[PDB]
Amino acid sequence: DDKDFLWPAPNEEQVTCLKMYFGHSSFKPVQWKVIHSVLEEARDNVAVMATGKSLCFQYPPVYVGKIGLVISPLISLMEDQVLQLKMSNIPACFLGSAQSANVLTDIKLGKYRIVYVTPEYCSGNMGLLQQLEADIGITLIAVDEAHCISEWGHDFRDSFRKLGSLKTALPMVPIVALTATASSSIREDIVRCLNLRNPQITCTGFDRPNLYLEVRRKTGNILQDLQPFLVKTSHWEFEGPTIIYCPSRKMTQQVTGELAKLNLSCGTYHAGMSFSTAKDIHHRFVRDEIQCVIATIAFGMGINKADIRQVIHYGAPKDMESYYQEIGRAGRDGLQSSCHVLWAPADINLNRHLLTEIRNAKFRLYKLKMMAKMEKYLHSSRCRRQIILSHFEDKQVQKASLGIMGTEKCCDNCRSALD
Numbered sequence: 049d050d051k052d053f054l055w056p057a058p059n060e061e062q063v064t065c066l067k068m069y070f071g072h073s074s075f076k077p078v079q080w081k082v083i084h085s086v087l088e089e090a091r092d093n094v095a096v097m098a099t100g101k102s103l104c105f106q107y108p109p110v111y112v113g114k115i116g117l118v119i120s121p122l123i124s125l126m127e128d129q130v131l132q133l134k135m136s137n138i139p140a141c142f143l144g145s146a147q148s149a150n151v152l153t154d155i156k157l158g159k160y161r162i163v164y165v166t167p168e169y170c171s172g173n174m175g176l177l178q179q180l181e182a183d184i185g186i187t188l189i190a191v192d193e194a195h196c197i198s199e200w201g202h203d204f205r206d207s208f209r210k211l212g213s214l215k216t217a218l219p220m221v222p223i224v225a226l227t228a229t230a231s232s233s234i235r236e237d238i239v240r241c242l243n244l245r246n247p248q249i250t251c252t253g254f255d256r257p258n259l260y261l262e263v264r265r266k267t268g269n270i271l272q273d274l275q276p277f278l279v280k281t282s283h284w285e286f287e288g289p290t291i292i293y294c295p296s297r298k299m300t301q302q303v304t305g306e307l308a309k310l311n312l313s314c315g316t317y318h319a320g321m322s323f324s325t326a327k328d329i330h331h332r333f334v335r336d337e338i339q340c341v342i343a344t345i346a347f348g349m350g351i352n353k354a355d356i357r358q359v360i361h362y363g364a365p366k367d368m369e370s371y372y373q374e375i376g377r378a379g380r381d382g383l384q385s386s387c388h389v390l391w392a393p394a395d396i397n398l399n400r401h402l403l404t405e406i407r408n409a410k411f412r413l414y415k416l417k418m419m420a421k422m423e424k425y426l427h428s429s430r431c432r433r434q435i436i437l438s439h440f441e442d443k444q445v446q447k448a449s450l451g452i453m454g455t456e457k458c459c460d461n462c463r464s465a466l467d
């Protein structure tokens with residue numbers, strides 16, 4: 049199941065390095081997402097993990113035989129990670145003012161794969177980083193406890209604000225900012241204060257008991273299907289901020305057309321609109337000038353909005369992984385939210401036909417497997433949350449979710465099994 053989520057697939061050399069230096073035979077999907085984006089795209093990342101964090105930033109410099117810099121204020125934990133790396137035959141060291149001249153020389157020569165430094169040491173030694181980059185090449189800079197750069201976080205540190213010059217001093221080096229807080233507002237501050245460019249955001253390890261899951265059959269008559277979600281007001285509206293994800297541009301236009309007849313505060317978003325009208329819809333939704341966005345998969349990434357109360361997939365989703373990213377945008381404030389899929393067998397027939405249009409054979413098989421998992425989820429009588437967590441989350445999140453599973457607030461299948 050985990051291997052199906054890996055896109056693209058790791059090669060043999062990547063797998064051999066993982067077994068030899070990290071004692072693992074396979075990458076976890078979130079680990080692979082960060083690692084692949086660093087190695088192949090030199091992309092900045094924000095990795096939010098609630099508790100295998102170290103592999104994300106330790107594996108890429110070890111694989112390419114270069115240097116990964118790790119910035120952290122947790123001195124004892126850095127010393128322990130240095131020790132664990134050495135026990136696995138990985139040259140690593142903690143570099144600070146008390147280090148020997150002989151150690152800095154081997155760092156300068158590219159003999160150490162991972163170098164741990166405090167933020168204060170890093171701030172006062174930028175020229176050394178420019179020298180390491182020009183002579184050896186820095187694979188990445190990891191910034192641990194990254195929430196410390198935020199003034200509205202719970203642990204602001206003066207030593208962190210100076211890390212905003214890393215991107216200017218080393219423009220080609222990707223930064224992997226790591227934190228254990230899933231706060232949406234702290235994440236936007238991490239991105240801004242570190243000067244990250246189009247960062248890949250990952251967020252994993254958290255159970256989300258505030259997300260109610262439901263799958264229901266459609267009639268195709270749009271208003272008949274959406275009426276149960278609507279509240280007559282003086283016009284009509286949803287309970288709160290809502291996203292309606294559709295499988296095509298035409299469906300976004302038809303759904304928007306029906307809600308516009310009701311004078312509902314809404315806007316359409318798809319990749320066929322002009323840049324200015326897309327920016328307008330995005331801005332109006334985050335400023336709460338519109339309550340509902342009717343969109344294709346093109347809408348969602350980079351949306352800093354914690355109070356999405358409802359996600360509706362109007363039509364069977366085509367891809368299980370995309371569905372997971374989309375529902376993950378609901379209730380980031382921790383308050384009650386709902387994620388509903390309204391589907392019909394005809395949506396699955398059409399989704400399957402469009403899959404034949406993917407010319408790359410390897411990508412078509414990956415998308416076919418994401419589609420088959422989505423179809424199994426839709427037709428299932430089992431707990432929806434159990435299925436989702438089994439595909440995407442670790443055993444501790446699965447174990448932690450056992451409290452909500454089986455109860456009236458879990459999913460539609462737990463509610464039906466109850467009575």
Ligand SMILES: CCc1c(N2CCN(C(=O)c3ncnc(C)c3O)CC2)c(=O)n2nc(C3=CCOCC3)nc2n1CC(=O)Nc1ccc(C(F)(F)F)cc1Cl
Pocket residue numbers: 230231247248249250251252254255256257259260261348349350351372373374375376377379380381382432433436437
């Ligand atoms: C889906 C991952 C996720 C997120 N993302 C949303 C999608 N995304 C982007 O849009 C995006 N991707 C790339 N680059 C940029 C710039 C982007 O914005 C990546 C981050 C995301 O933003 N958050 N926020 C949290 C919080 C957890 C606790 O504190 C509050 C907030 N957790 C997440 N997760 C994990 C999550 O949702 N798992 C989960 C657990 C149970 C169920 C269920 F079965 F029970 F229903 C369903 C799901 Cl999906």
Ligand SMILES: [Zn+2]
Pocket residue numbers: 430431432433434453454455458459460461462
């Ligand atoms: Zn359930």
